[PDB]
């Protein structure tokens, strides 16, 4: 996920 | 002090820590019962609540309907009733001692649904759904109205905001932000809704803007030094603190402070370790 890093 | 709960670094975490802006040091307190990231924090009656999120681990990726309560001088978590549905990357706000759970995701589903929690009743009830499906939504309370800001509907990232009127139970679109922001830090300081950082689908943002209700206008203020999305945010002593987040490469431990009188950001501390998707609140 590019937004949370998960 | 500023409490941070949950987060993500290689996996969802159980950390509960408290930052002291006066002395500059961190206190380590009771673990969450279930690891969580993409949750939100809030405070009612001095107690600290952890809402939604998910447990993303080496063994499974379970979205959370949980609500859990931490007592700052018992150092104990106690479970409360669960939400109607799991809400990863949820947003929460507090009006009249009641907690509103907004949006979030369960698997593929991006919720527009919203429900409310009654602390002295330990019950959730549905209220009117949003106009928009929103995960990674920022939530703020101003003049006892509930604002849902930005986020992600499953295909587009959002600069739209909408207002919830609890005494009429109807959502109303308002003026859109100047910037598309999902996973921003949204809070209220002075009497403006602040939206800091986020991800617009291409890049993490370091810009910051604020909403004036009377003029229905969003205005940009000083940008943070470090781009971040999935950050924690709170205001302490009339100053904005933003905690961790992801910058597209790194899990940030930087904690920045915005002074509204000078319109300047300055780095105040580093978290114990970088992490994104925390729940933050102050007590």
UniProtKB/Swiss-Prot annotation, chain B:
**Chief location:** cytoplasm
Q: What is the effect of changing residue 54 to A?
A: Loss of interaction with NFE2L2/NRF2. Abolishes repression of NFE2L2/NRF2-dependent gene expression. Impaired interaction with SQSTM1/p62
* A cellular-component GO term for this protein: Cul3-RING ubiquitin ligase complex
Q: Any idea where this protein resides?
A: Cytoplasm; Nucleus
Instruction: Say yes or no: keyword Cytoplasm present.
Output: yes
The entry's keywords: Cytoplasm, Host-virus interaction, Kelch repeat, Nucleus, Repeat, S-nitrosylation, Ubl conjugation, Ubl conjugation pathway
Report what the Swiss-Prot or TrEMBL entry states about this protein's PTMs: Non-enzymatic covalent modifications of reactive cysteines by electrophile metabolites inactivate the BCR(KEAP1) complex. Accumulation of fumarate promotes the formation of cysteine S-succination (S-(2-succinyl)cysteine), leading to inactivate the BCR(KEAP1) complex and promote NFE2L2/NRF2 nuclear accumulation and activation. Nitric oxide-dependent 8-Nitro-cGMP formation promotes cysteine guanylation (S-cGMP-cysteine), leading to NFE2L2/NRF2 nuclear accumulation and activation.
> Which residues does the annotation list for site: Sensor for electrophilic agents?
108
GO BP terms: namely: cellular response to interleukin-4; cellular response to oxidative stress; in utero embryonic development; negative regulation of response to oxidative stress; negative regulation of transcription by RNA polymerase II; positive regulation of proteasomal ubiquitin-dependent protein catabolic process; proteasome-mediated ubiquitin-dependent protein catabolic process; protein ubiquitination
Any one Gene Ontology MF annotation carried by this entry is: disordered domain specific binding
Task: Give residue numbers for the modification (S-cGMP-cysteine).
Answer: 108
Task: Provide the residue intervals of the Kelch repeats.
Answer: 1-46, 47-97, 98-144, 145-191, 192-238, 239-283
Q: Which tissues does it occur in? A: Broadly expressed, with highest levels in skeletal muscle.
Impact when changing residue 199 to A:
Loss of interaction with NFE2L2/NRF2. Strongly reduces repression of NFE2L2/NRF2-dependent gene expression. Abolishes interaction with SQSTM1/p62
Question: Which family, according to the similarity comment?
Answer: Belongs to the KEAP1 family.
Quaternary data: Component of the BCR(KEAP1) E3 ubiquitin ligase complex, at least composed of 2 molecules of CUL3, 2 molecules of KEAP1, and RBX1. Interacts with NFE2L2/NRF2; the interaction is direct. Forms a ternary complex with NFE2L2/NRF2 and PGAM5. Interacts with (phosphorylated) SQSTM1/p62; the interaction is direct and inactivates the BCR(KEAP1) complex by sequestering it in inclusion bodies, promoting its degradation. Interacts with NFE2L1. Interacts with BPTF and PTMA. Interacts with MAP1LC3B. Interacts indirectly with ENC1. Interacts with SESN1 and SESN2. Interacts with HSP90AA1 and HSP90AB1.
Cited function: Substrate-specific adapter of a BCR (BTB-CUL3-RBX1) E3 ubiquitin ligase complex that regulates the response to oxidative stress by targeting NFE2L2/NRF2 for ubiquitination. KEAP1 acts as a key sensor of oxidative and electrophilic stress: in normal conditions, the BCR(KEAP1) complex mediates ubiquitination and degradation of NFE2L2/NRF2, a transcription factor regulating expression of many cytoprotective genes.
Entry domain remark:
KEAP1 contains reactive cysteine residues that act as sensors for endogenously produced and exogenously encountered small molecules, which react with sulfhydryl groups and modify the cysteine sensors, leading to impair ability of the BCR(KEAP1) complex to ubiquitinate target proteins.
Supply the name of the protein: Kelch-like ECH-associated protein 1
**Organism of origin:** Homo sapiens
List the top taxonomic levels of the source. Answer: Eukaryota, Metazoa, Chordata, Craniata, Vertebrata
Within the intact protein, the region shown is: 327 to 609 of 624
């Amino acid at each position: 996920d590019p937004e949370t890093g998960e | 002090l500023i409490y941070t709960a949950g987060g993500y670094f290689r996996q969802s975490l159980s950390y509960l820590e408290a930052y002291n802006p006066s002395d500059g040091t961190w206190l380590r307190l009771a673990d969450l019962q279930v690891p969580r990231s993409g949750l939100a924090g809030c405070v009612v009656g001095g107690l600290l609540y952890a809402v939604g999120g998910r447990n993303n681990s080496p063994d499974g990726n379970t979205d959370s309907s949980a609500l859990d309560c931490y007592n700052p001088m018992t150092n104990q978590w106690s479970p409360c009733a669960p939400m109607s549905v799991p809400r990863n990357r949820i947003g929460v706000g507090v009006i009249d001692g009641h907690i509103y759970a907004v949006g979030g995701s369960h698997g593929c589903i991006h919720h527009n649904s919203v429900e409310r929690y009654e602390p002295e009743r330990d019950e959730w009830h549905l209220v009117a759904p949003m106009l928009t499906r929103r995960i990674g939504v920022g939530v703020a309370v101003l003049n006892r109205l509930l604002y849902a800001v930005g986020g992600f509907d499953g295909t587009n990232r959002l600069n739209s905001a909408e207002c919830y009127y609890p005494e009429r139970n109807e959502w109303r679109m308002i003026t859109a932000m100047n910037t598309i922001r999902s996973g921003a830090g949204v809070c209220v300081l002075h009497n403006c809704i602040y939206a800091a950082g986020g991800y617009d689908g291409q890049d993490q943002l370091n810009s910051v803007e604020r909403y004036d209700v009377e003029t229905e206008t969003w205005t940009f203020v000083a940008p943070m030094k470090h781009r971040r999305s999935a950050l924690g945010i709170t205001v302490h002593q009339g100053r904005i603190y933003v905690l961790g987040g992801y910058d597209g490469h790194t899990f940030l431990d930087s904690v920045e402070c915005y002074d509204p009188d000078t319109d300047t950001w300055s780095e105040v501390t580093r978290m114990t370790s970088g992490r994104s998707g925390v729940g933050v609140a102050v007590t």
